[PDB]
Design a protein around this ligand. Structure first.
Ligand SMILES: [Mg+2]
Ligand SMILES: [Mg+2]
Ligand SMILES: [Mg+2]
Ligand SMILES: [Mg+2]
Ligand SMILES: [Mg+2]
Ligand SMILES: [Mg+2]
Ligand SMILES: [Mg+2]
Ligand SMILES: [Mg+2]
Ligand SMILES: [Mg+2]
Ligand SMILES: [Mg+2]
Ligand SMILES: [Mg+2]
Ligand SMILES: [Mg+2]
Ligand SMILES: [Mg+2]
Ligand SMILES: [Mg+2]
Ligand SMILES: [Mg+2]
Ligand SMILES: [Mg+2]
Ligand SMILES: [Mg+2]
Ligand SMILES: [Mg+2]
Ligand SMILES: [Mg+2]
Ligand SMILES: [Mg+2]
Ligand SMILES: [Mg+2]
Ligand SMILES: [Mg+2]
Ligand SMILES: [Mg+2]
Ligand SMILES: [Mg+2]
Ligand SMILES: [Mg+2]
Ligand SMILES: [Mg+2]
Ligand SMILES: [Mg+2]
Ligand SMILES: [Mg+2]
Ligand SMILES: [Mg+2]
Lengths: 152, 208, 100
RNA sequence: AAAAUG
RNA sequence: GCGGGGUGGAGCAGCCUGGUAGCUCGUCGGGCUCAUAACCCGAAGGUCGUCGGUUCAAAUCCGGCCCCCGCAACCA
RNA sequence: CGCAAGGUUAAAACUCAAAUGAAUUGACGGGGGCCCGCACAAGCGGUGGAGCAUGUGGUUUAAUUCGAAGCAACGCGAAGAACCUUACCUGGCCUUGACAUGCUGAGAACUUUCCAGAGAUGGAUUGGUGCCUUCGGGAACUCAGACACAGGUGCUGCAUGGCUGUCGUCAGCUCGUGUCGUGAGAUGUUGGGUUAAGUCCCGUAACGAGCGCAACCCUUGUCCUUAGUUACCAGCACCUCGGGUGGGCACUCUAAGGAGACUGCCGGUGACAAACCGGAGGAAGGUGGGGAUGACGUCAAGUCAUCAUGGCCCUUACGGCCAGGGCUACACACGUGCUACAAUGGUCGGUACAAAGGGUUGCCAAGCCGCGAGGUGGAGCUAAUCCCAUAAAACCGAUCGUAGUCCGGAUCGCAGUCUGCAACUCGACUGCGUGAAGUCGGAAUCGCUAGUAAUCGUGAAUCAGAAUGUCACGGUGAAUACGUU
């Protein structure tokens, strides 16, 4: 807007795990106002992660998130005569939402049985970085690096 | 832009309904139709008499009509056989027994309907509008009347291009609701068509 | 909303109101299951020979002031727009503009 | 960045 | 007689390396605009001059027929 | 005169009623400076691709009745076209007429249950002549005859009133006196701040005022009192374990009257002003949320078809009555929606919680009969009591395993149900079966800042029947805003 008066309502409604990042992932994965469906999907994926990896799924989710969080991104700018793209570093808050959005978007289109094992596969892949989300993050990064002549 | 009806938006707050009674689905339409017909008939017959407000009160199986006018002798003439013939006329519009009360109003030149009708009837006699409107505003302002606005629209004079004129005096706050703006409209059927008259009168601020 | 339209719909009103029971009798005969075709066919013929302009489906209620067919509120007897005039003038009892 | 006419 | 060439309504890729018909202008329809022009986006439109032959298979290669050119050479 | 280019001196016919200078108000600029708005940006979800509904353009027709046309027309007048509506076409039938007033004459309307015709209409048609009389006659009714007429959804919204859209819910628009200018005009209304605001402060040839902003109004969120029926049930009891009963005024709830929030207090800043940034208390804090309220005027904006109205127009018809047909046609194009293209789902079984409203020419329960749409039946309710009427999405368990499919439902065939005199043109639902396009959609384009977007259901109006439209009510419930190029 033009005022900068908009507030920031805080939502932290983790039922049993008591995690903040999990709550925002819930809000991201929720569709058409179906909270219960999101709860069941995310918890099934989490339980699959647990039954697969001996490590506790909390830290696996955290390290998958921290391996998909970008640092800089390319943004278009209207110079008045040319189509230019400038690299800008991410705001510390925005990278979490970017990672969540990328993860859910890439998980939505696997083609396997259900989003339980879809999100399970994505979390395992991004835990060390063999998922498509990490590849596209690296592609965005290499855009930003190849457009470093502007930088500023 | 279009202005809301000043009397409509003040109904319930400071204005009062002219037809006050109670009914149900069986005879709500019947009672309402009877009231409109009786008001139309009264105005059409005693248009010569300066009648302003007609109130209808309907207790059980009866109707009590109170008429506001500035010339009571016209209806109360030589002990008011006019009243009885009027009752006989009214008895058929609504089958219930009728009851007529004639109410006198002080200061007829502070009443919106009377002022509008006077202006219209002056216009019908080919009196140019500016003098009539100025004298109406003068008379109203000379006694109380903390505000008055008069508007006349149509084919003023005889020119074949309609236009609008209006004069105001005092203050006439329409957006406020504590005020009691008396408002009236009337028409004049001259040889060139219809000329419309609107009058707003602001009397005071209703406190309490 | 011609004069003729109002007169000729008053005609429908009058004809429908004037019989007002024979239709009920014949429909009771027809609707009753145990009536026999002998007592059903004569009722059919009675319904057929009776004038067509005496039915509820043949009536279109209009404004009692002008006769506008569309925009009718059967709570009142008024059309779409004379309701507004009457309400603003204050003739309609108990009616105010609502916000809630 | 482009942009002639009524 | 010499050389080149025949491919949507018009003009050119696809030919060399046989297996994979595209492009520009037109027609139609829709976009952008207060409206037109200019622009932008879709759809239709050629199974590849013709026939045989080679090949498992020919718009891609070998002959005949028909036509078009650059030619010389025709000048009523 | 000049080498040439050309320079210098210098007319006329003809043609127009102007050409021109300086300044003023507005508008505009691919001039500039500040500021605002889902205007961008940051996000979510769509339209444009499919089928269907609905309106419009075009074409066709005897007619597809008129009006609305950039935003500000196109689920619009129409909150209900099978007959009517209805205004159009075909055909048939009326001329003081379907209606009102003036004149004359004869008589009750009613009910006569009949015939000719698609029908208006016509003809027989049991029965009573009626009410009050200065008892002479009159009223009102039915019909007949003559004119003055009655009639028109006929034309003109560029002759009008009234009503409405739009800029725009943007903060602007003016006047009195004074002053400056020969004047049109200008000051007030400019400046520095601040605000959502011409809101406020101080300055200041201006001093004041009005219409606007804000406030007064409705609703919601906290609490107190009043009051407990058809409403409620903490405590006692009865108990056939149902507020079912005695009973209670506890609570909720219903609806009237009232308190509360006013920058009130604290810290910081600020011209120690207005005001700004945090904090306590507080249910709510900075016009708490939403609605009604639309200034001077603009578009010769819309409407003569709601109504009224100055003209002009027809009188055997451009006025009336009736039966059928059309407005629902169809090589195409456009706007607005619904259902989908599935596994954050399709079915199967049992299971949980809302708000709002309508009902005596009405709602219409129980039992019973039918696969069903539905049928008999009649209780109760003039409604906090009875009915409409069981909310759905949600949760759990079984199944389907991504296949044009246990997806999707158009189209189509056969037989039904309901209202209506009558469902062929041309209604809605029901049973069986067939089962299409559709793999998330180019250019382009739309809505939305918090109980919001998205998604699921419920009610009302119009109405014999006919909602994917309109208006209204709740359940679940997001992401995003660095900022103004
Ligand atoms: Mg009329
Ligand atoms: Mg009807
Ligand atoms: Mg030109
Ligand atoms: Mg011009
Ligand atoms: Mg000049
Ligand atoms: Mg400008
Ligand atoms: Mg955007
Ligand atoms: Mg479409
Ligand atoms: Mg299309
Ligand atoms: Mg049309
Ligand atoms: Mg709409
Ligand atoms: Mg007809
Ligand atoms: Mg106009
Ligand atoms: Mg007008
Ligand atoms: Mg002077
Ligand atoms: Mg000046
Ligand atoms: Mg000025
Ligand atoms: Mg100026
Ligand atoms: Mg001045
Ligand atoms: Mg002045
Ligand atoms: Mg100003
Ligand atoms: Mg000025
Ligand atoms: Mg002010
Ligand atoms: Mg206000
Ligand atoms: Mg308004
Ligand atoms: Mg116009
Ligand atoms: Mg027009
Ligand atoms: Mg139509
Ligand atoms: Mg907003």
């Amino acid at each position: 807007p033009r005022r900068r008066v908009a507030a920031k309502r805080e939502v932290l409604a983790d039922p049993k795990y008591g995690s903040q990042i999990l709550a925002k992932f819930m809000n991201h994965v929720m569709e058409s106002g179906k909270k219960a469906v999101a709860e069941r999907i995310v918890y099934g994926a989490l339980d699959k992660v647990k039954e697969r990896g001996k490590a506790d799924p909390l830290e696996t989710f955290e390290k998958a998130l921290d391996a998909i969080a970008p640092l800089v991104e390319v943004k278009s700018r209207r110079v008045g005569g040319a189509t230019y793209q400038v690299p800008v570093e991410v705001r510390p808050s925005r990278r979490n939402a970017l990672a969540m959005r990328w993860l859910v978007d890439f998980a939505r289109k696997r083609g396997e049985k259900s989003m339980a094992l879809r999100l399970a596969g994505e979390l395992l892949d991004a835990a060390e970085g063999k998922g498509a989300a990490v590849k596209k993050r690296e592609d965005v990064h290499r855009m930003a690096e190849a457009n470093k002549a502007f930088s500023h | 832009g279009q202005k809301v009806h000043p009397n409509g938006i003040r109904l319930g707050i400071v204005k009062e309904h002219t037809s006050v009674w109670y009914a149900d689905r069986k005879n709500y339409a019947d009672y309402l139709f009877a009231d409109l017909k009786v008001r139309e008939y009264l105005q059409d017959k005693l248009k010569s008499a300066s009648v302003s407000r007609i109130d209808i009160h309907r207790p059980a199986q009866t109707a009590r009509i109170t008429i506001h006018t500035a010339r009571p002798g016209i209806v109360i003439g030589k002990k008011g056989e006019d009243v009885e013939k009027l009752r006989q006329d009214l008895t058929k519009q609504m089958g219930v027994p009728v009851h007529i009360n004639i109410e006198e109003i002080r200061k007829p030149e502070l009443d919106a309907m009377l002022v509008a009708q006077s202006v219209a009837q002056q216009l019908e006699r080919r009196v140019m509008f500016r003098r009539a409107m100025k004298r109406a505003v003068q008379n109203a302002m000379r006694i109380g009347a903390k505000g008055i606005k008069i508007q006349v629209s149509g084919r003023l004079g005889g020119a074949e291009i309609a236009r609008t004129e209006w004069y105001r005096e005092g203050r006439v706050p329409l957006h406020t609701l504590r005020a009691d703006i008396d408002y009236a409209t009337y028409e004049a059927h001259t040889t060139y068509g219809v000329i419309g008259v609107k009058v707003w009168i602001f009397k005071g601020e209703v406190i309490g | 909303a011609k004069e003729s339209m109002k007169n000729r719909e008053l005609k429908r009103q009058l004809t429908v109101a004037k019989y007002a029971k024979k239709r009920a009798e014949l429909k009771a005969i027809i609707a009753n299951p145990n009536s026999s075709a002998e007592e059903r066919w004569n009722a059919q013929v009675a319904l057929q020979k009776q004038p067509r302009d005496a039915s509820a489906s043949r009536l279109r209620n209009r404004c009692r002031l002008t006769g506008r067919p569309h925009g009718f509120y059967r709570k009142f007897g008024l059309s779409r727009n004379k309701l507004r005039e009457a309400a603003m003038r204050g003739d309609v009892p108990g009616l105010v503009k609502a916000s809630w």
